Amino acid sequence: FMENFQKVEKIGEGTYGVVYKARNKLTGEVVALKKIRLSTAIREISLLKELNHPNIVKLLDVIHTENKLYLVFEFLHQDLKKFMDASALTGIPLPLIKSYLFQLLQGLAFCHSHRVLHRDLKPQNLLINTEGAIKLADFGLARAFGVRTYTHEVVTLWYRAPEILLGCKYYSTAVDIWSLGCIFAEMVTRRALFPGDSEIDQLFRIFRTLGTPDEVVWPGVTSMPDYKPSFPKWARQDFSKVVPPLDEDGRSLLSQMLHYDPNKRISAKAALAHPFFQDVTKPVPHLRL
Numbered sequence: 001f002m003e004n005f006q007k008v009e010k011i012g013e014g015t016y017g018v019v020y021k022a023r024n025k026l027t028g029e030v031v032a033l034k035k036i037r038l039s040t041a042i043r044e045i046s047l048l049k050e051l052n053h054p055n056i057v058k059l060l061d062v063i064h065t066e067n068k069l070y071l072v073f074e075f076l077h078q079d080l081k082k083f084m085d086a087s088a089l090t091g092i093p094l095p096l097i098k099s100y101l102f103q104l105l106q107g108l109a110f111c112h113s114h115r116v117l118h119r120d121l122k123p124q125n126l127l128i129n130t131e132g133a134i135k136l137a138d139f140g141l142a143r144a145f146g147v148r149t150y151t152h153e154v155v156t157l158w159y160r161a162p163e164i165l166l167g168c169k170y171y172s173t174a175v176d177i178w179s180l181g182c183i184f185a186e187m188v189t190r191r192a193l194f195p196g197d198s199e200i201d202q203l204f205r206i207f208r209t210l211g212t213p214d215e216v217v218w219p220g221v222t223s224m225p226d227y228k229p230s231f232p233k234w235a236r237q238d239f240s241k242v243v244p245p246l247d248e249d250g251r252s253l254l255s256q257m258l259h260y261d262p263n264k265r266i267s268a269k270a271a272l273a274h275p276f277f278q279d280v281t282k283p284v285p286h287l288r289l
């Protein structure tokens, strides 16, 4: 039971607590409702209510009652994780991959221009609709929560930027570009790019593909908190082996999203101008709800 909602249904375990599909009692509208497992965060998250962009899941409300905290979002019917699983036999068509990447970059460019990072992008917080839109959920929450324990559930590391895995306590816009590059690669190949089981397995999967980073490609890397001079030194592989059959435009863009040094990583705004998007369109997905 809930005072202000009816037909409340669990839909997932999230970074911060249970996520429900719920119907507002007064209006009948269907929303996603994210009970935070437990004020500097309430004011800061409440600022996120002001943000509106077509590629960002609207934060409709912040409800603080009975010493509980709930976030109310507009509801979308499928996430990219489920869509990629449903699309595993055929693959997502390239024009739709390109459309989704373009739209996600517009959402990131918007948030970043408003000084809001995500820090934890992953297919589970990318939501799609029947009209061909994709939207990013949960921007700004990681900073407000303070990176921080809000679930006992197993955290996905697969999309974490190397700066994060090497113990850098200082985030930048580049962490979100890394995560989206990993998601791009996964849409293309139908396999996660770096499916690490632990922080060190995550870090070593990255190193085995992109080469072990050094001061030449990443000035400052050897001073990062969790950097170890004893890390094995892997040579770097070609993106042509990693994301076939992606064309050279897509591989060029992906390589710019996956530079080791966050400062060298392409921005969302610059990525939107990349030649890969010259022929972008907005196709209709085949969604089975």
Ligand SMILES: O=C(O)Cc1cccc(Nc2ccncn2)c1
Binding pocket: 011, 012, 013, 014, 015, 016, 017, 019, 032, 034, 057, 073, 074, 075, 076, 077, 124, 125, 127, 137, 138
């Ligand atoms: O909480 C998490 O970490 C991800 C997560 C998990 C489950 C649902 C969401 N969000 C939304 C938003 C809108 N329509 C549907 N689901 C996010």
